[PDB]
Amino acid sequence: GILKTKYGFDNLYDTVISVSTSNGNDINELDDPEHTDANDRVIERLRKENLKFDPEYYVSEYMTHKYGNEEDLEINGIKELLKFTPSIVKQYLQWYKDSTNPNLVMPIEFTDEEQKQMQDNLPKKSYLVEDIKPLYVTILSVLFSYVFEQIENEGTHTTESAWTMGKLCPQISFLDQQLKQVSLIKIAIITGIRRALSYPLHRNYDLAMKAWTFVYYILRGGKRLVIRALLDIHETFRFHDVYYVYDKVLLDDLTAWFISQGSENVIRSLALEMRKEQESLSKQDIEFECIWETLNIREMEILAESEYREQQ
Numbered sequence: 001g002i003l004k005t006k007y008g009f010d011n012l013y014d015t016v017i018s019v020s021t022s023n024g025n026d027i028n029e030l031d032d033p034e035h036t037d038a039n040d041r042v043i044e045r046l047r048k049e050n051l052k053f054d055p056e057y058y059v060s061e062y063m064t065h066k067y068g069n070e071e072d073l074e075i076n077g078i079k080e081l082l083k084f085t086p087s088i089v090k091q092y093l094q095w096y097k098d099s100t101n102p103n104l105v106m107p108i109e110f111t112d113e114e115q116k117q118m119q120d121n122l123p124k125k126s127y128l129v130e131d132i133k134p135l136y137v138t139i140l141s142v143l144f145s146y147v148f149e150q151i152e153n154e155g156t157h158t159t160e161s162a163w164t165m166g167k168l169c170p171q172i173s174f175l176d177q178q179l180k181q182v183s184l185i186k187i188a189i190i191t192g193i194r195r196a197l198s199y200p201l202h203r204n205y206d207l208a209m210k211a212w213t214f215v216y217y218i219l220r221g222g223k224r225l226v227i228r229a230l231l232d233i234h235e236t237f238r239f240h241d242v243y244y245v246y247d248k249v250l251l252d253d254l255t256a257w258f259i260s261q262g263s264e265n266v267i268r269s270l271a272l273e274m275r276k277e278q279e280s281l282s283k284q285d286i287e288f289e290c291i292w293e294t295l296n297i298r299e300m301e302i303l304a305e306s307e308y309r310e311q312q
Contacts, residue, residue: 005037007175008249009257010129017175020245027166027243029173038178045174046181050289053198058297059304061203067308078204086150088229089214092221105222105264114231118259121238127257134177136270137188138169138254139226143218144192145169146233148211152202162236162243167199168192172246185270186277193286197297205283205297212278219271223264230255 006014017025017033029048030036036044065078073079085093096102110118129135145168149161166172170179170191179187189212196208218229234255237247283298290300 001032001035004034007033009135009253010131012253013249016245016248020242024242025245027163027173027246028175029167030175033175036175038176039181041174041176042178042181045170045176049194049198053194053288053290055288055290055295055300058197058203059300062205062301063304063308065204065206066305076202078202078207081151081154081202081207082210084151084154086147086155086214088150088225088232089147089217092217092225095221105268106225108224108228110224110228114228117231117235121234121252122256122259123252125256127253127261129257129261132261133184135254135257136266137179137184138171138177138250139230139258140185140215140219140270140274141171141188141192142169142233142251142254143215143226143229144189144211145172146229147214147218148192148196148200148208149236151207151211151214152200157236159240162240162246164200165233165236166243166246168195170195171250183273183277185274186280189274189278189281190285193281194288197286205286209278212274216271216275216278219267219274223258223262223267226262226267227255227259230258 004014006012007017014034017028017030021028021033030041030044061076061078064072064076068076092106095106142165145165148168149157149164152164153161170176173195179191192212193205193208196211197203197205218225230251234247234251237243237251283301284296286297287294288297
């Protein structure tokens with residue numbers, strides 16, 4: 001509250017987020033984006049996630065998925081979403097199936113449009129960044145936000161796409177690259193799940209886990225495939241007349257830095273590490289404070305199933 005703390009890529013930016021909230025930036029979730037230190041952003045985010053989470057919404061989604069009739073499933077959409085494969089994932093999995101050496105990174109020839117985007121829309125500066133770990137974690141988190149949007153919209157962007165991506169990415173909504181109060185990869189995965197169960201239209205653990213599995217595939221595809229995703233994200237924010245501030249303060253530099261300095265070996269290790277962390281998780285790791293008691297989401301489901309069986 002008293003002093004300024006910078007934010008965004010390499011904590012270089014200020015002013016612009018505060019200005020944007022007077023001009024319709026509803027992605028920002030910090031009460032005081034210019035005067036909240038990194039640890040306080042985590043504390044505020046965790047508090048706000050517990051408040052945002054709606055257990056009744058969550059268990060209604062769960063009950064529809066598991067017990068809904070054909071029409072309720074169709075109206076809700078969950079079954080169709082869980083069958084959808086975004087183009088970027090599909091192109092990787094096709095190449096992986098057909099390759100004589102599937103261990104390698106996926107060859108990617110950038111389209112004319114992607115080339116023009118890189119030439120016309122990204123900063124032309126050199127980068128010297130001391131602390132790259134938070135950047136790779138940002139890539140992990142923002143890929144999840146992107147994949148989730150791609151699934152929920154069945155591959156067609158809408159005017160709400162930037163909001164969905166911004167809300168599922170703590171580095172955007174809360175300018176929070178720290179994530180942990182005080183592994184970081186595990187915390188990033190859990191954070192993505194908690195936010196996917198609290199903010200979007202479809203709030204479903206299987207859907208969130210599907211998105212993380214697809215992030216794993218994108219990372220396994222390698223640097224150029226990750227660039228393809230980052231360019232799509234950048235374009236989504238760039239031509240939204242409120243939300244472009246997130247390109248200014250984070251995604252412009254994240255994308256340009258990654259193109260110039262991103263490591264294939266780091267990306268492959270990140271793919272394998274995040275998959276190991278993801279596979280270690282269960283619903284018992286996903287907890288919320290509810291009206292106060294701490295409950296995991298499986299406990300919530302069981303309690304709801306019991307009430308439904310009694311009503312039947």
